[PDB]
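Notes continue from the previous slide.

Worked example: a multi-chain complex. Inputs as given:
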Amino acid sequence: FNMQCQRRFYEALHDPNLNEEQRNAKIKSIRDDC
Amino acid sequence: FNMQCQRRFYEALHDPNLNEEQRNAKIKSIRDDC
Amino acid sequence: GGPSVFLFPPKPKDTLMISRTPEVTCVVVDVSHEDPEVKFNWYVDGVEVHNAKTKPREEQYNSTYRVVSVLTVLHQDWLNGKEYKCKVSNKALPAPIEKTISKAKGQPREPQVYTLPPSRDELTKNQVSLTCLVKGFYPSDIAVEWESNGQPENNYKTTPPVLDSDGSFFLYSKLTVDKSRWQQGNVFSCSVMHEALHNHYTQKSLSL
Amino acid sequence: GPSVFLFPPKPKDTLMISRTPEVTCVVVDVSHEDPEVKFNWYVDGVEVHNAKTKPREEQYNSTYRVVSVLTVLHQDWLNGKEYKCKVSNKALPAPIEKTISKAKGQPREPQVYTLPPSRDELTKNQVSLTCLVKGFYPSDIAVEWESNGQPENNYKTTPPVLDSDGSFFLYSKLTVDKSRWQQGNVFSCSVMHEALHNHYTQKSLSLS
Ligand SMILES: *[C@@H]1O[C@H](CO[C@H]2O[C@@H](C)[C@@H](O)[C@@H](O)[C@@H]2O)[C@@H](O[C@@H]2O[C@H](CO)[C@@H](O[C@@H]3O[C@H](CO[C@H]4O[C@H](CO)[C@@H](O)[C@H](O)[C@@H]4O[C@@H]4O[C@H](CO)[C@@H](O)[C@H](O)[C@H]4NC(C)=O)[C@@H](O)[C@H](O[C@H]4O[C@H](CO)[C@@H](O)[C@H](O)[C@@H]4O[C@@H]4O[C@H](CO)[C@@H](O)[C@H](O)[C@H]4NC(C)=O)[C@@H]3O)[C@H](O)[C@H]2NC(C)=O)[C@H](O)[C@H]1NC(C)=O
Ligand SMILES: *[C@@H]1O[C@H](CO[C@H]2O[C@@H](C)[C@@H](O)[C@@H](O)[C@@H]2O)[C@@H](O[C@@H]2O[C@H](CO)[C@@H](O[C@@H]3O[C@H](CO[C@H]4O[C@H](CO)[C@@H](O)[C@H](O)[C@@H]4O[C@@H]4O[C@H](CO)[C@@H](O)[C@H](O)[C@H]4NC(C)=O)[C@@H](O)[C@H](O[C@H]4O[C@H](CO)[C@@H](O)[C@H](O)[C@@H]4O[C@H]4O[C@H](CO)[C@@H](O)[C@H](O)[C@H]4NC(C)=O)[C@@H]3O)[C@H](O)[C@H]2NC(C)=O)[C@H](O)[C@H]1NC(C)=O
C-alpha cells in the first residue's frame, strides 16, 4: 500500500481546519489519485 | 482444594481393573469422604 | 410464538474436580403468563432419571416467564460421553421440546503450558502483564487460574479457546500486576485444568 | 416471516483509503410465493440509493437469501454515522429495520508487545512467537505478521477480549520452526487500528 495514501488520508481525517464537507472533499481527492 | 482427593479420583477414574459400577462406587466414596 | 428451551453443559472446572458438583441446566423462557405450567423430563443416554432440581419460575422484566431445571451429573458420566436430554412440555406447545448435550467427541490431547514474562517495552508502565499460553489441547473444555504465595490472583482475563491449525485449541491468560510486585521477584503460577492432564491438573511458575 | 441481519465493515477496509468498506444486509427466510424483497438504506436518517443488491439464492433448506451491499465512506463509519437497512416483504406485517454504527466511546491506542517462545517450548520442533495487543478501543482491529519483507501466514489471533478497564486486548500466535527462530530471523507483528498514528504500527521480535 501507498504509505503516501495512508499518511494523507490520516492527516485529512484529523485536520481541524476542515469541516465535514471539506474533509470529505479532501479525502475523495486523496482516494481518487490513490 | 485438596490435592489428595484429586489424585484418588483421577486414579479411580482411569483404573482399568474397575468396571463402570466399580469405578462409580470408588469415586462416590472418594467424593463422600472429602 | 411459544416458550423456548436452552440446555447448558457443566463448567469445565466442575466436571474435573471431584470436590465440585457438575450439572446440566435446562432453561425454559418465554413461558406464557397464562399457561405457565412447565414439566421437565430428563434422560441420560435414553434412560429417564428423576433427581433433577427444578426451580420456581421467575417473572421476567419483559413480562414473560423463566423456568429452570438443574440436573446434577457424575463427573465420569460427562467425561465418558454420556448424553443428557431435557424434555419440556407446556400447554402452548404442539409437542414437547427436546434438547440434548454431551462432551465433544474426539481424541483428547494434553495441553502444553508456557509462561511468558512482560515484554521489555511494557516495563515503562506501572502495571505489567504476565502471560500464560496454553496450546494443543482437546477437547476445548479447560479452566485456567493464577496464584501467588499459595493464594489466588484474580486480576486476570483469559481468552476463549481458539482452534489451532492442527485441529487442537489454544488460549492465553493474562494476569495484570504492579511492576514492583513483579520486579521484586514474586513468584506467580498459571494452573491449568483439563481432562487430558494427569490428575486433571498442572502448573507452571513465572518469576524474575 | 423472513429475518434480517446487518453486518459492519471489515476493520481493515475502514482504515485503508485504498480499500472499500461496506455494510451488508442479509435477508433469510424469503418465501417462494412471497419472494419480492426491497431494501431501503439511510445514513443518519437520510436515505441513499447506491446500494447493490445481490441475486437471491435458493437455500439448500428450501428458503431464500437476499443480500444488499451499501458501500460506505471510511470517515463516516469512523465518525459514528448510523446505517439502517429496511427490508419490505409481503410476508411482513410491517417492514423490518436494522441499524448499526461503530461502538461508542473515546478511541484508545493499542500497545503492542512481542514475546519470544517459552524456554520450555524450545524443546520442540516448532515454537510460538507471541504478539499481545492491549488497551485498544473500540474492538475493531487487524493483526498480521511478516518477515524478510514477506507475509507469514502460519498464525492465529484470538478474538478481542474485554479487559477490566474497558479496553480490549488480544494475542496473535505465529508458529515457526525452531531453526528459523534460532537462526536469528526477524519477525514483525503489525497492527492496524483507528487510534494508531496513520492507523499503523509494527513491533519486531528475534533472538537475543
Ligand atoms: C435456511 O438456510 C439458511 C442458510 O444457512 C447456512 O448457514 C449454515 C451455518 C447452515 O445453517 C446451513 O443451513 C447453510 O449453509 C439459514 O440462514 C442463516 O439464518 C440464521 C438465522 O436463523 C443466521 O444466523 C445469524 O448468523 C449471524 C452470523 O452470520 C455471519 O456468520 C456466518 C458464519 O459465522 C455466515 O454464514 C454468514 O454469512 C454471516 O457472515 C458474515 O457475512 C458478512 C456479509 O455477508 C461479512 O461481512 C462477515 O465477515 C461474515 N462473517 C463471517 C463470520 O463469515 C449471527 O451474527 C447472528 O447472531 C445474532 O442473531 C441470532 C439470532 O438470529 C442470536 O441468537 C445471536 O445471539 C445474535 O444476536 C445478536 O447479538 C448482538 C450482540 O452481539 C446484538 O447486538 C444483536 O441485536 C443481535 N442480533 C439480532 C438480529 O437480534 C445469527 O446467528 C445465519 O447468518 C444465516 N446464514 C446465512 C448464510 O445467511 C436460514 O436460517 C435457514 N432457514 C431455515 C428456516 O432453516
Ligand atoms: C424475555 O426475557 C427473557 C430474559 O431476558 C434476559 O436477557 C437479557 C439480555 C434481558 O433481555 C433481560 O430481560 C434478561 O436478563 C429472554 O430470555 C432469553 O431468550 C434468549 C432466546 O430468545 C436466550 O438466548 C440464548 O442465549 C444462549 C446463551 O445464554 C447464556 O448466556 C447469556 C449471556 O451471554 C445469558 O444471559 C444466559 O442466561 C445464558 O447464561 C448461561 O447460563 C448457564 C445456566 O445458568 C450458565 O451455566 C452459564 O455460565 C451462562 N453463560 C454465560 C455466558 O453467562 C445461547 O446459547 C442461545 O444461542 C443459540 O441459539 C441462537 C438462537 O436462539 C442461535 O442464533 C445461536 O447460534 C446459538 O446456538 C446455535 O448454534 C450453536 C453453534 O455454536 C449450537 O450449538 C446451538 O444448538 C444453536 N442453538 C439453537 C437454538 O439453534 C440463545 O441466544 C437467552 O438465554 C435468554 N436469557 C435468559 C436470561 O434466560 C426472552 O428471550 C425474552 N423474550 C422476548 C420475547 O423478548
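Summary box: Chain C has two domains: 3-102, 103-208. Chain C touches chain B through eleven residues (CB under 8 Å).
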